[PDB]
Amino acid sequence: PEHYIKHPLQNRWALWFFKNDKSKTWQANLRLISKFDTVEDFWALYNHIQLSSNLMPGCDYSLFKDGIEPMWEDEKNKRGGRWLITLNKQQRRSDLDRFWLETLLCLIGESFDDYSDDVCGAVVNVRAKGDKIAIWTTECENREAVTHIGRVYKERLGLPPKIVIGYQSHADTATK
Amino acid sequence: EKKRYDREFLLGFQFIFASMQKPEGLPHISDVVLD
Ligand SMILES: C[n+]1cn([C@@H]2O[C@H](COP(=O)(O)OP(=O)(O)OP(=O)(O)O)[C@@H](O)[C@H]2O)c2nc(N)[nH]c(=O)c21
Numbered sequence: 001p002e003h004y005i006k007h008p009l010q011n012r013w014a015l016w017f018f019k020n021d022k023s024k025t026w027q028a029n030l031r032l033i034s035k036f037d038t039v040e041d042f043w044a045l046y047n048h049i050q051l052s053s054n055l056m057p058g059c060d061y062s063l064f065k066d067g068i069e070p071m072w073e074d075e076k077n078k079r080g081g082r083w084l085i086t087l088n089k090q091q092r093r094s095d096l097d098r099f100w101l102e103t104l105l106c107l108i109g110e111s112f113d114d115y116s117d118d119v120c121g122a123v124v125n126v127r128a129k130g131d132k133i134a135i136w137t138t139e140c141e142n143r144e145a146v147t148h149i150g151r152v153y154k155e156r157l158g159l160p161p162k163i164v165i166g167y168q169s170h171a172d173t174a175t176k
Numbered sequence: 177e178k179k180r181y182d183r184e185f186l187l188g189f190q191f192i193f194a195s196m197q198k199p200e201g202l203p204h205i206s207d208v209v210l211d
Pocket residue numbers: 026070071072073125127
């Protein structure tokens with residue numbers, strides 16, 4: 001074990017936590033948990049943190065490439081958007097953790113081939129009205145990349161017909 | 177060469193010893209970072 005060689009990731013990633021406290025400005029509620037850049041260090045982190053399904057409503061996890069803040073305002077996000085799925089109440093226990101882990105594996109495994117460079121990160125929102133999972137990409141008008149990421153992501157999630165997936169620019173989200 | 181990994185490869189590492197060593201320097205976030 002003292003000579004074990006870890007398996008490198010293409011990118012260094014940062015895992016963030018968001019705590020719901022409406023008294024604070026939104027970014028003030030972000031907390032960096034840790035960063036990693038190997039397969040084994042990914043699992044060491046994942047294996048020592050709470051499952052998404054056990055977070056308090058109003059909290060988030062986000063996994064973003066090192067140097068990209070998990071917010072619309074980042075240079076790498078402001079022209080981008082997200083591939084979003086929304087779950088119902090029953091699906092929190094049956095699917096949220098599985099879908100989130102699959103999302104993490106798509107990110108760290110660079111599953112979108114020559115378009116994985118358009119990936120910024122992913123977010124899971126634990127919400128009473130319906131949990132959300134999304135992959136954030138860097139440019140909504142990189143339509144080849146957006147298509148490829150969306151198509152592969154949906155296949156990897158294995159979504160049933162009742163859980164749909166769509167893309168939205170952050171500019172449109174911010175303006176609602 | 178880009179470092180690309182399929183899901184089965186990644187999952188195979190989840191419980192090897194290196195993946196069970198608690199990371200250093202974690203913040204104290206109750207019920208999030210499991211201590
Ligand atoms: C991702 N994000 C969320 N917020 C704030 O958090 C609020 C809630 O954003 P939310 O992503 O937490 O969704 P929620 O399910 O709680 O509610 P929804 O608006 O009905 O979809 C947004 O309206 C913003 O005020 C954000 N505020 C800033 N400045 N930048 C961000 O990246 C950002």
